[PDB]
C-alpha cells in the first residue's frame, strides 16, 4: 500500500488476510474459472505467500465473479500485499495507467465489500494512484464519495480506520487536482476533522490526529482553500493551538504551527483580518508568547513558533483594548477582563461606549438580557458573564449617565432587578451593586 508502514494499515491488511478463500475452493464453488483460479493462486503465492503480471486481469475477474465476502476479502488482501511488495503492485499500477478500465475497476473495488476488504482495496487504489502516470483525481473523488470511506472517517470508535483514511487523504493531497478533491472532501466532512482536533486537544489516536493535521495543512497550502476553511470554523485556530500546547510531539506541534500560519499567511485572502480575528478571539498572541518562552527540541518547530509569535505581535501592535472589548462583546463571552476592572480603560472608553447612539451600551444591554434569559441554567461561565455585564452596565451608568435612560428604556433596570433575585451570591451582589449605582446611595 501507499502507507502500509502505518500500524492502522498493517491492522487492516491483517484483518483482510484473516478472511482468506482459496482459489481452488472458489473454482469448485463455480465462483471463478480454471484460468482465473490459477491466476489467483499465482498472485497469492507471489504476494500473500510467481507474479501474475498480465494474469492480474483474470484475478480481478475472478474476484468480481466471486461475490462472497470471504473471497472479496482475500482478493483485497492479496492486492494490498502485492502493492506493498516491490516487485508486484507497480506492474498493476502500470497496467491500470495504460488501461483505464483496470483503473476504473480498481476504483470501484475500493471502499466496497467488507470493511477490511474495503480498507485493503482503498489502500491498493491509493498506492496505484501514487504513481504520476496512474494518478486520477476523478478516481480519488469517487473513492472519497463512497459511503464506506465516510463511515471509516467518521468511525470514532474505529480509530484505525479514521487514521488510515486521513493518511490516504494526506498522501493524495500532493497532486493539485487530488488536493482539490481532498479539499472538497474536507468541506463535506469537516465534522470528523473537528472531532479529531477536539480529541487531540483533550498511539492510534495520536497518529490519526497527526494525519488530520497534515491533511489540514496540505489543504491550507492553497490560499483559496485556507480562506474557505478560515470562515468554516472560527474556533479551529483556537482548537489547533490548544492541541499543540497539549501535545508534546515535535512533529504534531510543527504541523499545527504550519496550519495556523497558513490560515494567517498573506497568500490567503483577508490575511490581516483573519490574523486580527484569531488574536482577538483565540488569544493567539498570548499562546504564541508562551510557546516562544517554552523550549522546543525541533529546530523547524521552534522557527515556526517564532514566526507565528512575530506575526501575532505585529497583528496585536495595530490592535488595541477597544478591539478586544468589541470582539468579546460580539462573542458574548466575558470573564472579568482587565479592561472591566481598569478604571482608566473605562474612563477613556466611556465616549466610545456612548458613541453611535450608544451602540455599545445597547449591545451590552442585549447581552445582559440574554444572560438573564440564560440565567435559568445558572452555569458558572454564564454567571461570570452576567456579573461582567452587570459591572459594565454599572460603569456605563456611573460614567456618562445618559446611557442610564437608554438602559431603562431597553429594560436594563428590569434585567438588573430580575438578577437581584438570582440564586448565585455573586450575581446577586453584582445586581445589588448595579442597583445602588443606579438610584441607590
Amino acid at each position: 500500500k501507499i502507507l502500509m508502514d502505518s500500524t492502522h494499515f498493517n491492522e487492516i491488511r491483517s484483518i483482510i488476510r484473516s478472511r482468506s478463500v482459496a482459489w481452488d475452493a472458489l473454482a469448485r464453488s463455480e465462483e471463478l474459472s480454471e484460468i482465473d483460479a490459477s491466476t489467483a493462486k499465482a498472485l497469492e503465492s507471489i504476494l500473500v505467500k510467481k507474479v501474475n503480471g498480465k494474469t492480474l486481469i483474470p484475478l480481478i475477474h475472478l474476484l468480481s465473479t466471486s461475490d462472497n465476502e470471504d473471497c472479496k476479502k482475500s482478493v483485497q488482501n492479496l492486492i494490498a500485499e502485492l502493492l506493498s511488495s516491490d516487485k508486484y503492485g507497480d506492474d498493476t499500477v502500470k497496467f491500470f495507467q495504460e488501461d483505464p478500465k483496470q483503473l476504473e475497476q480498481l476504483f470501484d473495488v475500493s471502499l466496497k465489500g467488507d470493511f477490511q476488504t474495503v480498507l485493503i482495496s482503498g489502500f491498493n487504489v491509493v498506492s496505484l494512484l501514487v504513481q504520476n502516470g496512474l494518478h486520477n483525481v476523478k478516481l480519488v473523488e469517487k473513492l472519497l464519495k463512497n459511503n464506506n470511506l465516510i463511515n471509516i472517517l467518521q468511525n470514532i470508535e474505529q480509530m484505525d480506520t479514521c487514521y488510515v483514511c486521513i493518511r490516504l487523504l494526506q498522501e493524495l493531497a500532493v497532486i493539485p487536482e487530488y488536493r482539490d478533491v481532498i479539499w472538497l472532501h474536507e468541506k463535506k466532512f469537516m465534522p470528523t476533522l473537528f472531532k479529531i482536533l477536539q480529541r487531540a486537544t483533550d498511539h492510534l489516536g495520536i497518529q490519526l490526529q497527526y494525519h488530520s493535521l497534515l491533511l489540514i495543512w496540505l489543504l491550507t497550502f492553497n490560499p483559496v482553500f485556507a480562506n474557505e476553511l478560515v470562515q468554516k470554523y472560527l474556533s479551529d485556530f483556537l482548537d489547533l493551538l490548544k492541541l499543540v500546547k497539549i501535545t508534546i510531539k515535535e512533529k504534531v506541534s510543527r504541523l499545527c504551527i504550519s496550519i495556523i500560519l497558513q490560515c494567517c499567511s498573506t497568500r490567503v485572502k483577508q490575511h490581516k483580518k483573519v490574523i486580527k480575528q484569531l488574536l482577538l478571539l483565540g488569544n493567539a498572541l498570548p499562546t504564541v508568547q508562551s510557546l516562544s518562552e517554552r523550549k522546543y527540541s525541533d529546530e523547524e518547530l521552534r522557527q515556526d513558533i517564532s514566526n507565528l509569535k512575530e506575526i501575532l505581535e505585529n497583528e496585536y501592535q495595530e490592535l488595541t483594548s477597544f478591539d478586544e472589548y468589541v470582539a468579546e462583546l460580539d462573542s458574548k463571552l466575558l470573564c472579568w477582563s482587565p479592561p472591566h476592572v481598569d478604571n482608566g480603560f473605562w474612563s477613556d472608553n466611556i465616549d466610545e461606549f456612548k458613541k453611535d447612539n450608544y451602540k455599545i451600551f445597547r449591545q451590552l444591554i442585549e447581552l445582559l438580557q440574554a444572560k438573564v434569559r440564560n440565567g435559568d441554567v445558572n452555569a458558572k461561565q454564564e454567571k461570570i458573564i452576567i456579573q461582567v455585564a452587570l459591572n459594565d452596565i454599572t460603569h456605563v451608568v456611573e460614567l456618562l449617565p445618559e446611557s442610564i435612560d437608554v438602559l431603562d428604556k431597553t429594560g436594563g433596570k428590569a434585567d438588573i432587578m430580575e438578577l437581584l433575585n438570582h440564586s448565585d451570591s455573586r450575581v446577586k451582589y453584582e445586581a445589588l451593586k448595579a442597583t445602588q449605582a443606579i438610584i441607590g446611595y
Partner: peptide, 23 residues
Amino acid sequence: LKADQEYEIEKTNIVRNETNNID
C-alpha cells in the same frame, strides 16, 4: 514539504504575472 509546495505555487504565480506583463 507543504510550505515548500506553497512557495512553488506562489513562485509560479509570480512568473505567470510576468507573462501578463510580457503580454
